[PDB]
Amino acid sequence: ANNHIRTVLKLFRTIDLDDSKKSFYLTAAKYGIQTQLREPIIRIVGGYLPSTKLSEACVKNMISEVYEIEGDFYSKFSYACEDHAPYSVECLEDARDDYLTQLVELFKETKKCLRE
Amino acid sequence: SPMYSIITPNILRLESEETMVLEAHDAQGDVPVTVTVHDFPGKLVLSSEKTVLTPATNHMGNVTFTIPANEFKSEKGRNKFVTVQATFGTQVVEKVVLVSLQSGYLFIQTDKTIYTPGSTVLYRIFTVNHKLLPVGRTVMVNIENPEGIPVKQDSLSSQNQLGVLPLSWDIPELVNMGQWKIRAYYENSPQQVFSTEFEVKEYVLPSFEVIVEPTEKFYYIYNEKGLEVTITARFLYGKKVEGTAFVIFGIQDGEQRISLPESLKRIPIEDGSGEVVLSRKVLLDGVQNPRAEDLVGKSLYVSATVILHSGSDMVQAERSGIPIVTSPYQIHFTKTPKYFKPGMPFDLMVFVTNPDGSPAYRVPVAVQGEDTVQSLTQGDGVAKLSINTHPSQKPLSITVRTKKQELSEAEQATRTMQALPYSTVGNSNNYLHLSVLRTELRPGETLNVNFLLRMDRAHEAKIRYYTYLIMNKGRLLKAGRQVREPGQDLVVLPLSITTDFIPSFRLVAYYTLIGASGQREVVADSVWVDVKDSCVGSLVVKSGQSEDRQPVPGQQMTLKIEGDHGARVVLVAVDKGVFVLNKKNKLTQSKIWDVVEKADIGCTPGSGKDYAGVFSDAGLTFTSSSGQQTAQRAELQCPQ
Amino acid sequence: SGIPIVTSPYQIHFTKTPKYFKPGMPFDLMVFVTNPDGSPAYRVPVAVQGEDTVQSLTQGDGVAKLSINTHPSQKPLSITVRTKKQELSEAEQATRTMQALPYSTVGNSNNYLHLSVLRTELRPGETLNVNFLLRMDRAHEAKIRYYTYLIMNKGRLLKAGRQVREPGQDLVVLPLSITTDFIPSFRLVAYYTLIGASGQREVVADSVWVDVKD
Amino acid sequence: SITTWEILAVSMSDKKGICVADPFEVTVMQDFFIDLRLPYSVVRNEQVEIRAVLYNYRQNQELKVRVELLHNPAFCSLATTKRRHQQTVTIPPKSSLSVPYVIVPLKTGLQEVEVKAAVYHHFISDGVRKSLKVVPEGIRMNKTVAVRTLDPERLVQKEDIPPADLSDQVPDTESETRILLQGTPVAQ
Ligand SMILES: *[C@@H]1O[C@H](CO)[C@@H](O)[C@H](O)[C@H]1NC(C)=O
Ligand SMILES: *[C@@H]1O[C@H](CO)[C@@H](O)[C@H](O)[C@H]1NC(C)=O
Ligand SMILES: *[C@@H]1O[C@H](CO)[C@@H](O)[C@H](O)[C@H]1NC(C)=O
């Protein structure tokens, strides 16, 4: 549909990540969410009748979980990783794999919200 | 008078398991045997590994030992020899065998095939021994400039690394262009060096691959239609290209390339395929020799430049090696034995190949004489032919010619061979033929050799067994007996071909009798068998998904690896644009098997002038207490 | 239907094996290992009971080429084919026996002929080499100069020829052009003829069954 | 990257041997995507042309892209922090399109170039950030400072190599000096 699409996009603008963090980390996190949790969602929502209604409640739960998952990825990138220097690109690459993995797990779990 | 024989590979190797098969023909009771190896000249690298021979094994045994490498590194420019002196009871037999310095192979793998300055180089160095197993040795690596001056030197150990040594190098910003080289060599044997080439160039990745495949991989000189080349262009990710393509033709002789000015053409490609023809008038007028026949041998080359209607990207693709020939087939005698036996089938392995070099498929060959014989080639371009031989001493002049239909007789391919007869001991007429099937054998299926025999009825009771050996990759693999009851003239020995026999095994055989005035003699034979070239194990990669194909960028997918247990895989993913830009110096199983086969000691595909010749051709050394011993070898490579 | 309840996963058949052999010369066994329903078994290691060190592996079409030598004796020969696939208990291996009587000559003159041959799934077009192996003592060896051979296909004499044998040799290889006319099988017969004993005519023959891909 | 990856696996097993799998190819592809085309390097202060190529692979759906070149403080082009550069193009189905952009590099180093698309009436986007090298105008030449033969007895030997003139050296450019040592073998 289209009204559903506008509602979902309006909802993925409330998401906020800290600006003080490093630029490449922000791009990595935003690209991960935009490719694993906004493209399939937008595709699924586009295929609804206009009369069908969404359920934004656990979509807000989606947003709460994506804040938590980004927080864990940032913590693992900052100091948890030990095989390499902190704040370094190889630590980012090492953590991005499982960041996207839990992110796709979240999307797969939350694919049941989009209907009543 | 019992004999005691030692059979060992002709050239030994440092730090490897080398087998020495011991027999004691016509020996009664147990005999102690001790094998000791000493440096030549002088005198004790090893004197261990003694054995006790028993009639329970029909008096046959093997003693394996690994010679330490030390005196060995002092002198290397001149060949060095060791003496294998073994004592059978109170009788001593010794034989001097050559020792090489080569101890293993290093297969270098670089992820890409073209690098830009300021980009890191990631490469691996596999370390395997002559038997293709992981080994722990120390390597040295030097990375050469285009001119050939080392830029980086390093030393690594393969110990506890399972034979893989990942490495790196960040190319300096201000460097020379052209081919670079990486040379790696084992630390013990610095005179054998392995290498690969990676190119440093200014490039940006293309967007689509251009393929030019002519309709025939050659050009008939008397064809009045001209060369037929098809240019096809598809995007990298599987879509058709619309654009305009320029092409040009030239004559490539030796190393000088001359182009044809009247040949460049623009042939617009619709739906990603275009076709241009080089009329024979252009080919004749471009060259300064009007004699068309004198142009044979030289090769054409096609240079195709494609530009999209967008005009945003241009790609070049060149197909060289289009030979101008008068005959579409080339008959080779590489695999045929050069010596035969009077009064036996003489199996010919003709190798019909296309002019470019690829094997020919489904082509009928024939022998000019006795034209009643005719065959047809198998998958690998080898046609089994059999020619019966009269029992005569004259050399046999075999000529083979291709007899393909719808081809004029002035246009087929011919070749000639000289084959000389096996020479017995004192014209005793005691031979041995070892008939066998030769095809694209696959590991696992059995083979039935035919230990055919020919000797007078006066001595058919003296021979009761046939010894046989199997060379493979440079060392004896199996060595056993073959009992034959007297009065039986053909013996079939079922051979269990495992996957361990890749890619070829040089089966030999012999017996021993006493005849004429009562002098010992030995009669031998050899066979070369080609097995299909694949892994000794198995590995394959496929995709976990069974649905929702064409993954979008940024999407997880799971790839499944079906490899042997306990193994270790190493992965690399390369954009196909890189291979479009430079597709040379890749790594695959074919090159590994080619390198392994290029180091085999044997240097003739079977049979020989006589028994000493047969053994030396196989790559062995048969010496006995009586004296019948093979000829000495002191060169790493057999004469060309 | 047809899910058979069995105590052995393989069944050994002797449909294709010759029921007669020649004393003192190779005898080619063609076992046909099949699944209990009837489908041809693939890649099963079958072996003979005696000299268990000899074994083979069955080809794709379901026949395993096993060769066992023979003593030059007139007594009937007993074959106990016995599969030995791994991951199966010895109570699970399928077993089978067979008796093959010896070829009987004329007047016990010890004349035999044998046509040793490749045994795989031949495809039309490629060539097959047959070995006209002969056994004859040198007393009467100058009397044989050729081997006549015939080809039987679908109930007709497809191609009858000759094979000249220059005296002095005991093996000659006759190349056969297996065209597409040979589908699916051909029974290559052969014979010669000599004057033996006190001047009595006699003939010695043999045959081979070859299966071509259908 | 929208391309065809070729994945090669090499085995190293202790008991069996070494294997090299046949290459396995996965063909990554999207319905509508940008393929920005850049030269390897563009010389500083010299105007060059950059093409954005937009692809559409819907079988029968005409598309309405809105491309855009975000501002970059390094280069110079029509984009500015106050005004944005937008072409609203139309892509016929199963057809490409080319958009021209002119950019003047201004500072050295490695600089990024990006274009961002946004389909109309559907909700599809694709932007590509590619980085190209910019180098100061000049050429690579390697003048030999000196060649000398070392002989401690015929010439110890205290030898000094004066620095090269570097008269034509381009400012703010790294210069590499290579020193090679090779012996002189004698025989016979
Ligand atoms: C001798 O060769 C046989 C071949 O079957 C092999 O089993 C045996 O291990 C070899 N001897 C030694 C000492 O390796
Ligand atoms: C006899 O058989 C041969 C087999 O090659 C065949 O060519 C021929 O037509 C037949 N008939 C005659 C009269 O030769
Ligand atoms: C300078 O570089 C060139 C590469 O074009 C090469 O021949 C060599 O490294 C140097 N040659 C001279 C003459 O300085």
Residue numbers in the entry:
A (entry chain D): 1 to 116
B (entry chain A): 1 to 43, 45 to 71, 73 to 642
C (entry chain G): 322 to 535
D (entry chain B): 776 to 930, 935 to 967
Recite the paper's sentences.
Albicin is a potent inhibitor of the alternative pathway of complement from the saliva of the malaria transmitting mosquito, Anopheles albimanus. Three distinct pathways of complement activation, the classical (CP), lectin (LP) and alternative (AP), are initiated by different sets of effector molecules but converge at the point of the proteolytic C3 convertase (C3bBb) of the alternative pathway which cleaves the scaffold protein C3 to form C3b.and anaphylatoxin C3a1. Here we describe the cryo-EM structure of albicin bound to C3bBb, the alternative C3 convertase, a proteolytic complex that is responsible for cleavage of C3 and amplification of the complement response. Albicin is shown to induce dimerization of C3bBb, in a manner similar to the bacterial inhibitor SCIN, to form an inactive complex unable to bind the substrate C3.
The dimeric C3b-albicin structure (class 4) was refined with C2-symmetry enforced, producing the highest resolution reconstruction of any of the 3D classes. The core part of the structure containing the macroglobulin domains MG1-MG7 of C3b is well ordered, while the complement C1r-C1s, UEGF, BMP1 (CUB) domains are covered by weaker density and the peripheral thioester (TED) and C345C domains are more poorly ordered due to their high flexibility. The symmetrical dimer interface is formed by interaction of the MG4 and MG5 domains from each C3b monomer (referred to as monomers A and B) as is seen in structures of C3bBb containing SCIN. In our map, density accommodating two molecules of albicin per dimer is located at symmetry-related positions adjacent to the C345C domains of C3b. The interaction surface of each albicin molecule contacts both molecules of C3b in the dimer. After particle subtraction using a mask corresponding to the TED, CUB and C345C domains of the dimeric C3b-albicin complex, the remaining core structure containing the macroglobulin domains of C3b and albicin from the C3b-albicin dimer structure (class 4) was refined using localized refinement with C2 symmetry enforced giving a map with local resolution of 3.1–3.5 Å at the C3b-albicin interface. The C3b binding region of albicin is comprised of portions of α-helices α1, α2 and α4 as well as the α2-α3 loop. The inhibitor sits in a groove between MG6 and MG7 of C3b (monomer A) which also includes the N-terminal part of the α-chain (αNT). The side chains of Tyr 31, Gln 34 and Arg 38 from α2 contact C3b residues in the region of Asn 738-Arg 740 in the αNT segment of C3b. Although generally similar in its binding site to that of SCIN, the contact points of albicin with C3b differ from those of the bacterial inhibitor due to surface differences in the two types of inhibitors. This result shows that the C3b-albicin dimer is sufficiently stable to be detected in the absence of FBb even though FBb binding strongly favors dimer formation as shown by size exclusion chromatography.
